[PDB]
């Protein structure tokens, strides 16, 4: 699925990801433009053998299983391909481990490299 950008900011909030460990939605919108362009399917290879998965390109070396990863340690339990789904339910509870783990949303390059510091506010402009 590809979200819309106010249909994806609606679906996050209602999961609690609007000032999760005190990120606002903005950062979040922001961070799944940059990382999947809001597609719930987008998978990208690394360089180290692991895959990101879905809309916030969570990696099958330390958070969910793919069956081909080196070092694998599927800390949010669950298979890569659930974070795929059209639902993004799995994705955030995911994230939400993630961004608890220490570096904060610094774990999402494409938002270190793209969001961070910028106006993220602009990303739910026109939102309800």
Same mark, same amino acid.
Request: charge should be positive; aromatic fraction near 10%; proline fraction near 2%.
């Given at each position: 699925? %590809?979200f819309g950008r106010c249909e994806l900011a609606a679906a996050m909030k209602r999961h609690?990801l609007d000032?999760?460990?005190?990120?606002?939605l903005?950062?979040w919108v922001?961070?799944?433009?940059?990382?999947?362009?809001?597609? +719930?399917?987008? *998978?990208?290879?690394? *360089?180290?053998?692991? *895959?990101?998965?879905?809309?916030?390109?969570?990696?099958?070396?330390?958070?969910?299983?793919?069956?081909? +990863?080196?070092?694998?340690?599927?800390?949010?339990?669950?298979?890569?391909?659930?974070?795929?789904?059209?639902?993004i +339910?799995?994705? %955030?509870?995911?994230? $939400? $481990?993630?961004?608890?783990?220490?570096?904060?949303?610094?774990?999402? %390059?494409?938002?270190?490299?793209?969001?961070?510091?910028?106006?993220?506010?602009?990303?739910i402009?026109g939102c309800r």
């Amino acid at each position: 699925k %590809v979200f819309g950008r106010c249909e994806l900011a609606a679906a996050m909030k209602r999961h609690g990801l609007d000032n999760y460990r005190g990120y606002s939605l903005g950062n979040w919108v922001c961070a799944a433009k940059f990382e999947s362009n809001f597609n +719930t399917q987008a *998978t990208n290879r690394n *360089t180290d053998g692991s *895959t990101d998965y879905g809309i916030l390109q969570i990696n099958s070396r330390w958070w969910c299983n793919d069956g081909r +990863t080196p070092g694998s340690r599927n800390l949010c339990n669950i298979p890569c391909s659930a974070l795929l789904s059209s639902d993004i +339910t799995a994705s %955030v509870n995911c994230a $939400k $481990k993630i961004v608890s783990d220490g570096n904060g949303m610094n774990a999402w %390059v494409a938002w270190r490299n793209r969001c961070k510091g910028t106006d993220v506010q602009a990303w739910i402009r026109g939102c309800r």
